[PDB]
Amino acid sequence: KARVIVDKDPVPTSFEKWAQPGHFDRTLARGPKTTTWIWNLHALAHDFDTHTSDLEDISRKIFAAHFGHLAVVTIWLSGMIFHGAKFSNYEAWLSDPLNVRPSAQVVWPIVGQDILNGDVGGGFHGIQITSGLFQVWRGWGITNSFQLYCTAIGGLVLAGLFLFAGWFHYHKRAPKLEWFQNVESMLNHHLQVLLGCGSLGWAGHLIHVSAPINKLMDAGVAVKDIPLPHEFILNKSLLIDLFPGFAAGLTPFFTLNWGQYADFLTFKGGLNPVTGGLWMTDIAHHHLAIAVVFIIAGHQYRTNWGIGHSIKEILENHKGPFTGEGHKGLYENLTTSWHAQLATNLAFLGSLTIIIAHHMYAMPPYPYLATDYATQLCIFTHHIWIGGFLIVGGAAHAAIFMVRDYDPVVNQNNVLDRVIRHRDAIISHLNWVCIFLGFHSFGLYIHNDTMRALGRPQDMFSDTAIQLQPVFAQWVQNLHTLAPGGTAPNALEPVSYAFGGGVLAVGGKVAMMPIALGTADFLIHHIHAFTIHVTVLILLKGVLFARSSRLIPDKANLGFRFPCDGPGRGGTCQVSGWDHVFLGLFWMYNSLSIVIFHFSWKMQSDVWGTVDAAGNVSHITGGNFAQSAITINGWLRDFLWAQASQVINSYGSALSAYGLMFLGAHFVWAFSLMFLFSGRGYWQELIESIVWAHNKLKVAPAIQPRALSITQGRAVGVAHYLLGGIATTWAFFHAHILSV
Amino acid sequence: MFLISWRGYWQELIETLVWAHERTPIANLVRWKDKPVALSIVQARVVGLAHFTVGYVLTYAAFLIASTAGKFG
Amino acid sequence: SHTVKIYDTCIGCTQCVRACPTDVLEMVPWDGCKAAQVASSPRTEDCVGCKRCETACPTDFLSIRVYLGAETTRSMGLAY
Amino acid sequence: GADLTPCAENPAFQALAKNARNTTADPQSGQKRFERYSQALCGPEGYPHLIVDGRLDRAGDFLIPSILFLYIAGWIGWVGRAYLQAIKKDSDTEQKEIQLDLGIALPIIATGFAWPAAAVKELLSGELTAKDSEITVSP
Amino acid sequence: LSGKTPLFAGSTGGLLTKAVEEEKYAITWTSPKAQVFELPTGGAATMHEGENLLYIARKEYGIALGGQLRKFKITNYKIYRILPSGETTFIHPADGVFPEKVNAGREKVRFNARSIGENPNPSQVKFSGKATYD
Amino acid sequence: ASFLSSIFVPVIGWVVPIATFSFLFLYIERE
Amino acid sequence: NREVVFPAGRDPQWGNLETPVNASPLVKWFINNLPAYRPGLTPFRRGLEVGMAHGYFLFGPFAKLGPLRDAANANLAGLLGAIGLVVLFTLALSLYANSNPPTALASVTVPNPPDAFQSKEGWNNFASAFLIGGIGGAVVAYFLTSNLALIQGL
Amino acid sequence: QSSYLIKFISTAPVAATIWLTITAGILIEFNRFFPDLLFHPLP
Numbered sequence A: 001k002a003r004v005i006v007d008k009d010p011v012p013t014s015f016e017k018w019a020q021p022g023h024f025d026r027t028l029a030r031g032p033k034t035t036t037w038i039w040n041l042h043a044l045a046h047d048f049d050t051h052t053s054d055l056e057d058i059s060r061k062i063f064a065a066h067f068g069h070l071a072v073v074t075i076w077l078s079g080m081i082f083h084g085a086k087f088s089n090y091e092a093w094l095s096d097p098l099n100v101r102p103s104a105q106v107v108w109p110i111v112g113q114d115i116l117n118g119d120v121g122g123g124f125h126g127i128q129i130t131s132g133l134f135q136v137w138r139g140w141g142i143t144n145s146f147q148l149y150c151t152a153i154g155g156l157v158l159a160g161l162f163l164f165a166g167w168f169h170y171h172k173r174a175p176k177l178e179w180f181q182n183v184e185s186m187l188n189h190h191l192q193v194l195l196g197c198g199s200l201g202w203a204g205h206l207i208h209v210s211a212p213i214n215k216l217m218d219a220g221v222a223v224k225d226i227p228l229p230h231e232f233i234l235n236k237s238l239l240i241d242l243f244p245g246f247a248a249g250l251t252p253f254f255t256l257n258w259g260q261y262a263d264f265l266t267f268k269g270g271l272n273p274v275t276g277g278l279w280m281t282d283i284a285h286h287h288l289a290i291a292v293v294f295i296i297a298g299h300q301y302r303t304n305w306g307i308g309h310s311i312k313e314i315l316e317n318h319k320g321p322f323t324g325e326g327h328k329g330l331y332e333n334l335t336t337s338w339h340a341q342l343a344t345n346l347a348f349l350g351s352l353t354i355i356i357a358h359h360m361y362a363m364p365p366y367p368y369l370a371t372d373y374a375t376q377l378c379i380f381t382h383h384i385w386i387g388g389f390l391i392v393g394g395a396a397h398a399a400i401f402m403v404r405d406y407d408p409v410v411n412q413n414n415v416l417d418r419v420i421r422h423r424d425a426i427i428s429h430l431n432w433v434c435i436f437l438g439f440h441s442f443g444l445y446i447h448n449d450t451m452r453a454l455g456r457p458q459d460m461f462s463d464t465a466i467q468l469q470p471v472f473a474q475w476v477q478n479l480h481t482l483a484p485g486g487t488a489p490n491a492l493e494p495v496s497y498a499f500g501g502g503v504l505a506v507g508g509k510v511a512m513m514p515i516a517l518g519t520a521d522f523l524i525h526h527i528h529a530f531t532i533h534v535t536v537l538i539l540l541k542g543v544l545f546a547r548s549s550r551l552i553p554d555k556a557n558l559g560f561r562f563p564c565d566g567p568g569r570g571g572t573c574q575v576s577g578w579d580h581v582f583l584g585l586f587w588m589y590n591s592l593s594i595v596i597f598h599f600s601w602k603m604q605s606d607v608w609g610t611v612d613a614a615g616n617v618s619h620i621t622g623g624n625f626a627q628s629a630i631t632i633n634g635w636l637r638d639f640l641w642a643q644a645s646q647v648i649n650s651y652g653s654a655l656s657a658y659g660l661m662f663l664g665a666h667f668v669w670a671f672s673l674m675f676l677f678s679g680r681g682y683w684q685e686l687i688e689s690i691v692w693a694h695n696k697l698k699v700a701p702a703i704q705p706r707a708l709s710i711t712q713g714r715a716v717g718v719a720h721y722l723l724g725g726i727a728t729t730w731a732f733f734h735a736h737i738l739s740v
Numbered sequence B: 001m002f003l004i005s006w007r008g009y010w011q012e013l014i015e016t017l018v019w020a021h022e023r024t025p026i027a028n029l030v031r032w033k034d035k036p037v038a039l040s041i042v043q044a045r046v047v048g049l050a051h052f053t054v055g056y057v058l059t060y061a062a063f064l065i066a067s068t069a070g071k072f073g
Numbered sequence C: 001s002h003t004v005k006i007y008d009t010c011i012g013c014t015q016c017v018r019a020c021p022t023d024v025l026e027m028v029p030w031d032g033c034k035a036a037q038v039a040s041s042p043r044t045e046d047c048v049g050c051k052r053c054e055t056a057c058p059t060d061f062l063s064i065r066v067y068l069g070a071e072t073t074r075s076m077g078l079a080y
Numbered sequence D: 001g002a003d004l005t006p007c008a009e010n011p012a013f014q015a016l017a018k019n020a021r022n023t024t025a026d027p028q029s030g031q032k033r034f035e036r037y038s039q040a041l042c043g044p045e046g047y048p049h050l051i052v053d054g055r056l057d058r059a060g061d062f063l064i065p066s067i068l069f070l071y072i073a074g075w076i077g078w079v080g081r082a083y084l085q086a087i088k089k090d091s092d093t094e095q096k097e098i099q100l101d102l103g104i105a106l107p108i109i110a111t112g113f114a115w116p117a118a119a120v121k122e123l124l125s126g127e128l129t130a131k132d133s134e135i136t137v138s139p
Numbered sequence E: 001l002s003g004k005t006p007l008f009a010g011s012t013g014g015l016l017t018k019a020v021e022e023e024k025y026a027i028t029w030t031s032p033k034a035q036v037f038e039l040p041t042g043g044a045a046t047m048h049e050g051e052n053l054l055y056i057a058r059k060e061y062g063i064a065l066g067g068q069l070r071k072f073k074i075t076n077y078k079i080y081r082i083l084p085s086g087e088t089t090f091i092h093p094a095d096g097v098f099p100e101k102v103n104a105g106r107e108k109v110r111f112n113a114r115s116i117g118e119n120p121n122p123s124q125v126k127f128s129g130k131a132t133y134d
Numbered sequence F: 001a002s003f004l005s006s007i008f009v010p011v012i013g014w015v016v017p018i019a020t021f022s023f024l025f026l027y028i029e030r031e
Numbered sequence G: 001n002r003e004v005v006f007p008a009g010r011d012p013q014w015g016n017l018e019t020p021v022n023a024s025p026l027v028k029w030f031i032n033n034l035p036a037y038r039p040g041l042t043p044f045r046r047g048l049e050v051g052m053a054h055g056y057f058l059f060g061p062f063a064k065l066g067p068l069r070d071a072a073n074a075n076l077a078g079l080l081g082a083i084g085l086v087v088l089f090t091l092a093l094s095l096y097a098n099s100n101p102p103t104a105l106a107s108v109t110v111p112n113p114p115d116a117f118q119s120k121e122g123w124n125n126f127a128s129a130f131l132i133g134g135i136g137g138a139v140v141a142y143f144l145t146s147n148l149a150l151i152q153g154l
Numbered sequence H: 001q002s003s004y005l006i007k008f009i010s011t012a013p014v015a016a017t018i019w020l021t022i023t024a025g026i027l028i029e030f031n032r033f034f035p036d037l038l039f040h041p042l043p
């Protein structure tokens, strides 16, 4: 029964509540007797569930809060392209994308910081960029600055509309709870319009604008000689010369004579030799196929015409012998709790973001991205990290659903109740797996690290010694190299040259080549499996044991965020679902940090490097990965100690900021250790003595000062531990790759 | 680990291992005499700092001696 | 095992007994003219030592303390 | 003076002065920098060295900066001390700490230029120190 | 000791080897209705209309359950301690009156007539075998 | 007398741990 | 179809759950008729069969992967190295036996009381048989692998 | 009302941001005209 239900003018728009803080909560609204009130104000600002219990009030805040968030992203995205318009070398970069490095940031001639605007290239003095926005605009067919200047103003205009929306909705026209609960209507709309039509539209831009323009640009024509996009639409003579399939018109589409469009809807599946990047026609045929699949898929659900599926009926009818009632009650949990929806969306979105990073490096989808190793490395590293954070957030809100929104009446002998009733077996076996892998993933390094020191290189786990080869992956590789012909016959070249095939060379660089898998990759892939399993153990344990444990029978009453539940029973320290998330983040950081290290050294040693006319590929680090990555000292020597030479020696040059942020990052990491190792008890007694000196000199504060709370001290530490950690490798990855 | 990670996480973890060992077929024959429990709060502080110190002492001695011995000043 | 000692600053709020997970504390009649109720700790053997009694006491400093001592199966919270 | 020479005549200083790397937008910022630094004392490396002895021959190094700081810093403490005391007489003290009463604060910020006089006045006879017997203490 | 078991499929979280060897516990309660209640160690279970009985590994599981029972307006919950030899002892409402409410028959235990500041120093009491909290 | 190293080293690595941990494990577990 | 997972026995209060892996027809026979649970055997015969299985198992890793695997005395190192490991395994039993070991547990797959491992005598007799059978299994595996070329050469 | 807006500006963050930006801009702007200032040159 889809319907638009709205409440008119629930909440006014006065500036009164701005002045008095803590309006959202009653405890904070009383007054700030203590400095912990300040920290609690921020920690409870987005805890709408604590402010009120009416789901209408919660959902209205959430739906409007999203709009204010989009304005921030649009202002950001519009801000990036604006810098490309005014302060940049993009117009000059198109003339020579292989000799001019991309820059869009300029720092003013104030104290000593004009050095950062070095000779990046093209007569422009600016900071070199690694986000890859230059390659995106070329994929968008943007060839002049005024074109970019127009798009930036459009984003700022779009920002006000989103901003106007959240005001209009929370204050003037607030939807009721029924408007959000019609799930079946929501999913049809997003799949078909937001994803389907949005994909179908982008196919139009690629076919009409990007593919023709880029087909002229790689040919060798000057940038000024390229016609504008509207010129292609009006004058069809120019379009037919490149893609003669358009001469037939739209009649082959309706008559199902779709082969006439083969020129610009190809299935080559390889990279463009001229510009390192996938073919625009292949990308053009991409979104058209995606849109039809999405448009069709979204009609599955009923949305108030009797035709379609009810998700409740799908889930309930998937019972089985082993699972008692199957998926019964999950629809009720997901329709009565925002945290459950947030946990599912975060977890799979994070895994998606990691899945993007692996596709992009092997299948570079933009022109000249592969030759820019700096953009390629930071791009992979970026999304790899963002996906790791979002996955951990999924476990947190998964546990928050348990303490706050779990209904035992609904979850009775269902798939979830049955999972909690054997949680001991889930963790005890996952405990066994984590120990098994940590021994047989890291112990093999120690055996190699120990043997090479003893002068016994024959007894190692190396390619000449006992080698454990990854036969399973090498088998899967050959199937992809042979997909040209046989299975997937119409494809001319494989989906990626990473699986195998011939080498591709752009200028003097190499875009991609076969990534051979040896003993080193067999070990590192297990190291990843080891580190991934442990954070799952930490996070999954918090979800199941948040309600109760053998130690604590009533853990839900204390809440999701409680420090200890006392010092007895031995010690109940960090027993909450919150503290599991706190611990899992360190392991998320540990696991994710080896992935990018596996990426950096392998791609530099095996893949990237200058290429000669005869095909001789002079790799960057000289193929040292196979015989050095098997030992821990090899990474310390060949990866960290050696490649960090550019960072420390960056002083007196344009990359000096990276050497500073690199060194400064170690500080914040160590500053984290104040809060993790210490405890609130010592610090409150220190403040006591300091308060005496103020009471002496009559500088005593009315707001009585107290040390930080326990969970805050843990939160403050992990924030520093990760910020100081990530910023370190951030500068090392940047300064090293930018020099080479 | 002993500094950052504190007891209450580990005791619950050990309780699962107690379940499996008591409910596994063949290792059910053998059983602890003293009940296994997580290290106390003060103990983990003791174990953690010795680890902090022993690592601190050793890895600098290696650097102090090897750097000086290799060059011999 | 863990000794629970009560002092004269009690005022009969009874908030300590309601917080006890294991029912160690029990209110008893104060024969004097202070109130009709003052706390006690008869079943001290089941004191796990979670200090919930102390957090619930409204005095300046505690009317009831929990001095830790020897451990047992009942105190360590072991279900095995 | 210890292991150093005058900065004007040191060769290593003149060697760096030719390549000064002007900081600001002004082209001659580099040459103007090394010109003023000729007054100071320099070492073998070519960089200048400051002497905080307290001798009046070299007082711009630390002594003049020292006086300029303490006048500025005492302004901040005297202002904060007076604003905090004035609030305590009012009823709602905690809210005024967060939501500042600018009507009370800006008159105090207008003062503070004469903080040394008020400091001596409170020290000689006044409220610069509270008694030890009337302050909270541990056992 | 009599009653009916709450109807649930079972759970790993529950009774272990300690029950056979030493001091398993039990809890009894009676409800007019038959609702769904969360168990002390994971899971959910229904409850019969008369004389429900559940075996628990510790005393903390029962009072934690009893607090949940009070949400359903059930105030008659009795906890036992069953030894390996079958000896049962009625514990939690040791008298008919609950602990939070006062009863005349009870006596004060481990009460110090002094305040905490008045306790002696440790140096005043060393090698005597007595503690400061006495 | 370099052969003594071949006899005294493994005694420290194998015989001494086995004998000490054997007695201690029984001593700590005694009643 | 209906449920496959049930509570241990009639009581759902107890921890263990009846599952296919725990309470299938096939698994119950194998585990209960293994020497550690087989009915009608003395403690000595149980340890002999167990050790004989383990000495034959432990010879392999030392020989084909230990040091001197690529040498003439490779198979000999496996026999001596395995016996040294069996002796430590034998010593461990004597300590667990001579420390008043509490009891042996009964699970769903082995519902009855498992065996007479409820005393020091049962474990001590188990230990004496482990060394006898344990050394025997390794000696067997040595002569086969060393003379496997001859046995095929026949 | 304007009285409510003034209270918002007088709060801790906005008062701190307005003040620190002013003190920052002074040092920032003074340093572009008077570049280096390692010490006070003494006549």
Ligand code: CLA
Binding pocket: F009, F010, F012, F013, F014, G066, G067, G068, G077, G080, G081, G083, G084, G087
């Ligand atoms: C500190 C004392 C100590 C000493 C003296 C040794 C000595 C030895 N270790 Mg060892 N080890 C020690 C501590 C010590 N370990 C510790 C603390 C660890 C833990 C990390 C290890 C881990 C370790 C591993 C992982 C390995 C060794 C191996 C070896 C042997 C290698 C000899 C060789 O050149 O190849 C072999 C040369 C040969 C001629 C074959 C060796 C035949 C064995 C040693 C005969 C032993 C007979 C045995 C004791 C019989 C007892 C029966 C009796 C009780 C009835 C050697 C006997 C290696 C090995 O395979 O030994 C078998 C091996 O793989 N050790």
Ligand code: CLA
Binding pocket: G154
């Ligand atoms: C259908 C299956 C089958 C198979 C595969 C065999 C195979 C064999 N039989 Mg046989 N047999 C069978 C059924 C079978 N039999 C039946 C049904 C009968 C009843 C009529 C017989 C009666 C019979 C007699 C009477 C004799 C054989 C012999 C033999 C062997 C002679 C090989 C040769 O040329 O000279 C010899 C070649 C060699 C390479 C030497 C062989 C050494 C033996 C086979 C090694 C066995 C080790 C053994 C696995 C240890 C068991 C312990 C283990 C279970 C743990 C050969 C292994 C002859 C023999 O003496 O074998 C020793 C012999 O005299 N068989």
Ligand code: CLA
Binding pocket: A011, A012, A013, A014, A015, A016, A017, A018, A019, A023, A024, A060, A061, A062, A064, A065, A067, A068, A069, A072, A163, A164, A165, A166, A167, A170
């Ligand atoms: C047009 C002006 C206007 C006015 C006068 C109000 C007034 C009000 N709104 Mg409202 N609102 C507006 C616009 C406005 N809103 C818009 C445009 C949106 C859509 C985003 C909303 C969405 C909204 C929600 C969802 C809620 C309110 C609420 C409120 C009330 C309390 C707000 C408060 O005291 O916190 C004042 C808080 C601030 C001034 C801080 C806001 C920070 C902004 C939004 C984000 C800044 C991001 C920034 C880039 C991060 C940088 C970080 C780094 C650099 C340090 C109050 C009546 C709340 C309410 O009624 O409570 C029951 C409530 O729940 N409003």
Ligand code: CLA
Binding pocket: A042, A043, A044, A045, A046, A047, A346, A389, A390, A391, A392, A393, A394, A396, A400, A561, A578, A581, A719, A723
């Ligand atoms: C879609 C993303 C998303 C959303 C909508 C939420 C939303 C929420 N989370 Mg959540 N979370 C997420 C992702 C998300 N989270 C991820 C990825 C993690 C893993 C790190 C977590 C971990 C997490 C925990 C552990 C907790 C929450 C909690 C909450 C709730 C209250 C938070 C609050 O008061 O905000 C205000 C939050 C703050 C003021 C903290 C500020 C943290 C700053 C931004 C860190 C600095 C990072 C910055 C980039 C550093 C550089 C700049 C700096 C140097 C200037 C709220 C419902 C809390 C709760 O009670 O839920 C019921 C809670 O306990 N979340």
Ligand code: CLA
Binding pocket: A431, A434, A435, A436, A437, A438, A439, A442, A443, A446, A534, A537, A538, A583, A586, A587, B001, B004, B005
């Ligand atoms: C380098 C430091 C370090 C190491 C080695 C570990 C090790 C471990 N942590 Mg961990 N941890 C650390 C830092 C570390 N942690 C920090 C800083 C934190 C705070 C965030 C945590 C937080 C944390 C949590 C929250 C969890 C772990 C878990 C684990 C275990 C995973 C199982 C495994 O890998 O098998 C064991 C593997 C090893 C011990 C690796 C080295 C072993 C070598 C190869 C063998 C030694 C050779 C030989 C036998 C020596 C004999 C010598 C003889 C003389 C005695 C393992 C014990 C998880 C766990 O226990 O789940 C099972 C878990 O839940 N840790």
Ligand code: CLA
Binding pocket: A439, A440, A442, A443, A444, A446, A447, A450, A459, A460, G058, G061, G062, G065, G066, G067, G085
């Ligand atoms: C934890 C990982 C690991 C692994 C896999 C190995 C592996 C190895 N090490 Mg080594 N080592 C390690 C860590 C590891 N090491 C560490 C951390 C150190 C530093 C102390 C060393 C130091 C070291 C030295 C100094 C030496 C070795 C040597 C060896 C080799 C001989 C092994 C041997 O004789 O053991 C024998 C092993 C056994 C008797 C037990 C095997 C257990 C089996 C495999 C269990 C299987 C379970 C089964 C699948 C499940 C049953 C299911 C059931 C239901 C049916 C072998 C390649 C030796 C060598 O020369 O290398 C070539 C040697 O001298 N190691």
Ligand SMILES: CC1=C(/C=C/C(C)=C/C=C/C(C)=C/C=C/C=C(C)/C=C/C=C(C)/C=C/C2=C(C)CCCC2(C)C)C(C)(C)CCC1
Binding pocket: G052, G053, G054, G056, G057, G132, G133, G134, G135, G136, G137, G139, G140
């Ligand atoms: C399929 C299957 C399976 C598998 C199995 C296996 C893998 C087996 C094992 C195997 C083994 C583990 C074997 C072993 C055996 C051994 C033996 C065969 C022994 C021998 C012995 C002997 C013969 C000795 C004798 C002696 C003595 C005692 C003394 C003196 C000397 C002599 C030498 C005379 C399972 C069950 C898992 C599961 C289910 C299914």
Ligand SMILES: CC1=C(C/C=C(\C)CCC[C@H](C)CCC[C@H](C)CCCC(C)C)C(=O)c2ccccc2C1=O
Binding pocket: A674, A675, A676, A678, A679, A680, A681, A683, A706, A707, A708, A709, A710, A712, A713, A714, H016
């Ligand atoms: C240091 C530390 C503290 C003490 C840390 C404190 C009190 C942080 C204080 C942060 C700032 C400095 C508070 C004051 C901020 C001022 C009001 C800002 C002045 C205004 C100008 C800056 C404009 C804990 O409370 C703690 C608790 C638990 C585990 C570890 C620790 C821990 O390590």
Ligand SMILES: CC1=C(C/C=C(\C)CCC[C@H](C)CCC[C@H](C)CCCC(C)C)C(=O)c2ccccc2C1=O
Binding pocket: B001, B002, B003, B005, B006, B007, B008, B010, B011, B037, B038, B039, B040, B041, B044
């Ligand atoms: C891992 C871990 C555990 C579990 C650790 C356990 C149970 C210890 C297991 C180690 C075993 C006993 C092997 C250790 C062997 C040592 C190498 C030698 C110790 C013997 C000396 C007496 C010589 C805690 O109990 C804990 C408690 C509080 C904060 C952090 C932690 C913590 O991090």
Ligand code: SF4
Binding pocket: C004, C019, C020, C021, C022, C023, C024, C025, C046, C047, C048, C049, C050, C051, C052, C053, C054, C066
């Ligand atoms: S320490 Fe815990 S169990 Fe003991 S009386 Fe206090 S609250 Fe109750």
Ligand code: SF4
Binding pocket: C009, C010, C011, C012, C013, C014, C015, C016, C017, C039, C056, C057, C058, C059, C063, C064
């Ligand atoms: S003062 Fe403390 S112990 Fe005494 S009655 Fe009140 S809460 Fe209970």
